[PDB]
């Protein structure tokens, strides 16, 4: 049969052009060639503080945006993580498989915890939850951005450990990281990736930003003083990132854009890029407002959770049977 | 209405006279005065390696022993933890509430991990699972042995944190630790508690040990060379522990036993204690074999899980609503 895809996005804010370019844009292509599960992973979002009203709102917005960008609910399964208890069940079992040392050495943990104050346990232990998200659906392929590469590697290790300790049950999944746009950088700090939970809203463009806002954010994007538009990731990380965004959203190659802007300044380059982004987001936002106004949004998520529960609950039964939990 | 009790025992082996004296014996009394939930916590057991066949077997044996000691399934709710998904769901939410530092400072973790080799994450993170076990049922009272005192204190902290961060939802539970027998000591190392997962079977007496075996284990119990039977926890921890077991199982006070064995040796004292233990276990074992032979054991657990799911799933809904997970 068809190979299986699973991917998740946190409702920790409104998704960014980084999320779009790095992941969501490819979901829309993949849905026709694979058995696809695309998840709103709200249990991942609460690994740090979320205002309850904002979280509820962002869950619905993410669902609407999934559909607005062109995911077809008849070709892919769209659902909310917490509405499928199997994810928490399998997460616990995999927490008993993973070693503490493996979690502590994770790059993303050591980064998000540096400055600690106090760190929730969830921030340390979300990787086995992610592994459960993937392994529950006998997933073959996991489309993600570059920053999730190590997490997929851990998932593969956990799957193999379980398989050899108890018996062959899990498919060993493989990451699919796009050749371009797998790490869109922050607009205000071109050495960090763009993150939808950045405390500085200028760092990112959300798919729901209006024209004025996008113009402002691109205008204030950090650049060098050299005044020349060419790609150089080491010497010109800001302009390089903007070129990468321009390129993947316009269809023009970086090399083509360099020529188009030969003898031109950053001012006109930024003004142009803003409009490219705006025109890209325009049809997305129109369809988004449609979904936010309808009961059909809830019906899609209802049906998706129904489907996901049937598949995931069966895998939980098999996992329990392998470990000896519960009863025959 | 009636106040609510919750307590759990791991199917990590066959329960001991330590488990009996410290917890299970009091369950049988409490069931008539309170709304009681008594749980076979198999998700706790897998925080360390369990052979799947042994685990399945120990789950059933624990259920049978719960009933054999006199727990009435019409007066208390008896169920298996993994058959109620709400425990894993609530555990994850509480993992996002607890801080890593709080888990690392737990005495039981620092002890069970010293020697580390490799430590499962579950061994670090089972306290929030325990907190979920308790808080899901609006529990007022938690009957446990001394070693779980710090865990109940953490549970109270987590409940308060949730209540003040989101809104009053949880009852703040209170530990009930018996005045006598809250920490029965190992037979081979009187400075450690008796534990059903001890690698040395001589350390404990299980409720299923036969007469020959009990005689052997009591005979080899570590004692001093002083040859006098009197209670002195510091100077005579072995004989003191044996006196404590003799006392709580026979009904005689320690002071009475000291007199009864004045001018007597450890040999006759140990031979007598063995028979006291044997006669205590005799009716328990008879009823145990009855339950292991019947389909009614499964029917009891079916009904218990049904009841527990109704109560716990509703609390999960309230927790999710408070945190903003899922949908309205
Ligand atoms: N700058 C980026 N470029 C490309 N892909 C990204 C970027 N940031 C995140 N992603 C991808 O989008 C996905 C969803 O991740 P996530 O929901 O964590 O978004 P995020 O922006 O990192 O939010 P948060 O700041 O809350 O971590 C993952 O597949 C991840 O690889
Ligand atoms: N020596 C003991 N004396 C009194 N109570 C005990 C003793 N050991 C455990 N308990 C109690 O019995 C309970 C069930 O605990 P648990 O299932 O962890 O048993 P355990 O013997 O500690 O097993 P393990 O060795 O797997 O930890 C708890 O309420 C605990 O306080
Ligand atoms: C904080 N949790 C988290 N950050 C991430 O980037 C991952 C993502 C969002 C994720 C969770 N489950 C997944 C399954 C497949 C692909 C990505 C994810 O989780
Ligand atoms: C390793 N897990 C663990 N050890 C313990 O002693 C506790 C006990 C068994 C426990 C788990 N949930 C509970 C709820 C109420 C009373 C005791 C427990 O858990
Ligand atoms: Mg992220
Ligand atoms: Mg214990």
Tell me what the structure shows.
Two copies of one chain form a homodimer. The first copy, chain A, has 13 helices and five strands. With 328 residues, the first copy, chain A, is mainly alpha-helical. Chain A folds into two domains: 1-183 and 295-328, HUPs (Rossmann fold, 3-Layer(aba) Sandwich); 184-294, Tyrosyl-Transfer RNA Synthetase. In chain A, the strands form two sheets. Chain A has a three-stranded parallel sheet with strand order 1-2-3. Chain A is globular, with a radius of gyration of 21 Å. At the A-B interface, helix 3, helix 4, helix 5, helix 7 and helix 13 of A face helix 3, helix 4, helix 5, helix 7 and helix 13 of B. The structure holds adenosine-5'-triphosphate (2 copies), the ligand CNC1=NC(=O)[C@H]([C@H](C)c2c[nH]c3ccccc23)O1 (2 copies) and magnesium ion (2 copies). It is classed as ligase/ligase inhibitor.
